Write an enzyme that holds these catalytic residues in place. Structure first.
Site: not given
Ligand code: YPG
Ligand code: MG
Ligand code: MG
Ligand code: YPG
Ligand code: YPG
Ligand code: YPG
Ligand code: MG
Ligand code: MG
Ligand code: MG
Ligand code: MG
Ligand code: MG
Ligand code: MG
Lengths: 205, 206, 202, 204
Positions: A121-123, A125, A127-129, A153, A173-175, A181, A187
């Site tokens: 994963e990228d991030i 937040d 954790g529900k996903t 986060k 913070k929103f990164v 993205d 991206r």
């Molecule tokens: N660019 C950014 N994106 C973020 C940020 N915090 C959360 N997010 C996520 C927003 N997001 C998406 O846009 C999903 C679709 P994709 O962009 O194609 O992977 C999911 C968020 O990630 C965390 C969730 O999975 P979670 O709350 O269930 O753990 C952030 O600080 N910057």
């Molecule tokens: Mg993700």
């Molecule tokens: Mg996104």
């Protein structure tokens, strides 16, 4: 470890100190995590991953779209390990997207049965996903399933889920950048950065 | 531009967060500047150098031994610029050691510098005495211009006031190793810049 | 019993320059790309492993032969460094530089595993001369890695321990190999054209 | 335009022992066919070619999974490198699609009025790309171009030629750099030819 801990009061870097694409010049406030630092940390994570998971066939599962850069780079470091060591293990790859939540795309998940599954994963937040994806994956009886997330986060909205491998622990913070993205933009940026008000307004949905 | 400012209080990074060669595991205290961050900053410096010096043939002078990694990487980024742009300029290289005129050891005849854009490349500026005296020599060969790029500049009361034209990082008055910077010829084989521990200090001491 | 390197045949056409990214100041000065930069890296990665296999049992001193050896030296060392930090096992490494037959303090060699790093072996006379000098400093072991070895009747039979590519009797430039100090600033190894040959002629 | 780097029918490839190769594929490969580094060198030039032609307007880069993922990531890395070291650049957005029916992408209306770059690992018959193009064109992109790492010389071709090509190769089955045999060999950085024992071992 909680990964590289980035403090709440982290000031980040002036953009003028780095190479930045011109089309994002006014849309970013600071560089937050330099690309090169992401790479150094990912190199160590690849070693940690092979230490824990290199005993058996690995299926690496990319969570699109945000996960794609971390996935490609992590796997590249893992491959580097596997071709310069005595011991190596086969690795196959798959890609899923999550759209409450349902899995979009991907192979039949029966391909995960008996394998060492690495979700990338990228991030994290809330954790529900991840909680949701894990519950699905475990029903196919993988040999093991682990999660590697570039970023975790610090947030009061956390359900308590923590991944197995963590690049960086960041403030609430929103990164953007490194495939993370804002409305599909940013991206195409190698660094992780914080978006400016100008940028937020410009790319607002 | 003082470059990327690393403050006196900067704690650096725990070693267990990075890949570190095992034979230095006890000899380092922190990672100070990760290799990747050096690369990102050097990418930017390469663009800055071409902006100022890219108008005429460049002779790039590497100050051995510590300068060799910064030199190789800086020039790699300059080459990347030059093969992906419309206008480009030839670059030649030379390697020197340093120790009346400063003694330049192992390089070409300095007449090679005449009428050229000369880029002197260093790992670190400390007192600044080495660069001040090298510049006094090089001017006598009538370069078209002469500039200095240094990966690191120390904040020190022992500075004679010299400031380079291009700087990666401005750091505290602490002894750092890695990325070809050494302590008694050790730690050059380390990709990160790090602060050496007291135990490592003793082990590799004279 | 040892790898003779990547053998490049006499009839190897090389590659159209227009297929690659080439510095524009050399566009008319090169005839073909001969060994792409990326292929040099791939071969060098394997050579680094071979080096650690044979020499990793004791402190290694890498000796760079300037000027031509500098690129191969830096890259080969970077791959050795990667090997050394992604395993529990590692060995200290120090570096030195020498420029050449006349030489321009090698106590840094005594009792250690010395790796001499060269761009190209042609006649072999330079390496035979350097080896006889290096052995006077009583190293534990001496090996030589050369990016390129040229097939030539003028060879005195010296074979390095590690070889990237074995090439025909052609003058090549790039990846720090020069023609009158030019073409060092080029990532690929290439054959020089008639235009470049005369332009940068001494 | 070009035809790309032409690899001849009688190309011998390289001895595996000259390169770094994952041990678990040691007996499954016959030769290295296109070294990873040569792919990178060619991809670097393709990035400049792409920007010359498509860089005037917002690009949507479409990755054809799974095989296209490595070429896609590297091509876009080289494009990113151009955009941060040049005076002017253009935004790029991305999407990933699987074909069987387009699965996992954004709504195709997102392509309308955009410069669309489709990124593929290989063109063989060309039927897949003709099909994907016919769909994309329903949504009126400003332009649409195709980049393929590999194009095979085959009489099975329906005649379709992509806009950007890495390498034009013989009609041989290749693996590596995300190209698979029954999902194996994606974890190989070089492009290689499979051995007889490899085909047997990973046979579906
Ligand atoms: N660019 C950014 N994106 C973020 C940020 N915090 C959360 N997010 C996520 C927003 N997001 C998406 O846009 C999903 C679709 P994709 O962009 O194609 O992977 C999911 C968020 O990630 C965390 C969730 O999975 P979670 O709350 O269930 O753990 C952030 O600080 N910057
Ligand atoms: Mg993700
Ligand atoms: Mg996104
Ligand atoms: N590893 C380290 N080395 C340092 C440090 N501060 C200074 N130095 C330098 C010590 N040094 C050398 O060892 C020269 C030979 P080489 O190692 O082959 O480049 C020169 C010092 O650099 C500054 C001088 O040039 P200057 O005071 O004239 O400006 C440091 O914090 N760490
Ligand atoms: N650019 C190129 N240079 C070449 C070529 N064949 C030989 N040479 C060499 C010419 N040369 C130098 O210019 C030495 C100085 P430097 O450039 O600073 O390393 C040494 C030659 O290499 C082999 C000899 O050492 P040897 O005959 O003793 O084995 C070639 O095809 N291209
Ligand atoms: N590993 C290899 N794969 C190949 C090869 N020639 C074709 N192909 C393709 C096989 N293939 C797939 O497995 C699709 C699924 P994925 O692997 O996840 O991208 C598609 C074929 O590519 C060409 C077709 O699109 P086309 O005939 O319509 O032009 C080859 O020499 N090696
Ligand atoms: Mg110095
Ligand atoms: Mg020193
Ligand atoms: Mg030489
Ligand atoms: Mg020469
Ligand atoms: Mg495909
Ligand atoms: Mg396939």
């Amino acid at each position: 470890s909680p990964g590289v801990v980035i403090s709440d009061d982290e000031p980040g870097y002036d953009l003028d100190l780095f190479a930045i694409p011109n089309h994002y010049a006014e849309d970013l406030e600071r560089v937050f995590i330099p690309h090169g630092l992401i790479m150094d940390r990912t190199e160590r994570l690849a070693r940690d991953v092979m230490k824990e998971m290199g005993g058996h066939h690995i299926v690496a599962l990319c969570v699109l779209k945000g996960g794609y850069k971390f996935f490609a780079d992590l796997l590249d470091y893992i491959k580097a390990l596997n071709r310069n060591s005595d011991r190596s293990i086969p690795m196959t790859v798959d890609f899923i997207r999550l759209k409450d939540i349902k899995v979009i795309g991907g192979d039949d998940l029966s391909t995960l049965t008996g394998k060492n599954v690495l979700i990338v994963e990228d991030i994290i937040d809330t954790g529900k996903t991840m909680q949701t994806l894990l519950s699905l994956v475990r029903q196919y009886n993988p040999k093991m399933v682990k999660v590697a997330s570039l970023l975790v986060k610090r947030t009061p909205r956390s359900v308590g889920y923590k991944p197995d491998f963590v690049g960086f622990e960041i403030p609430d913070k929103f990164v953007v950048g490194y495939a993370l993205d804002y409305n599909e933009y940013f991206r195409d940026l190698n660094h992780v950065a914080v978006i400016s008000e100008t940028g937020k307004a410009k790319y607002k949905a």
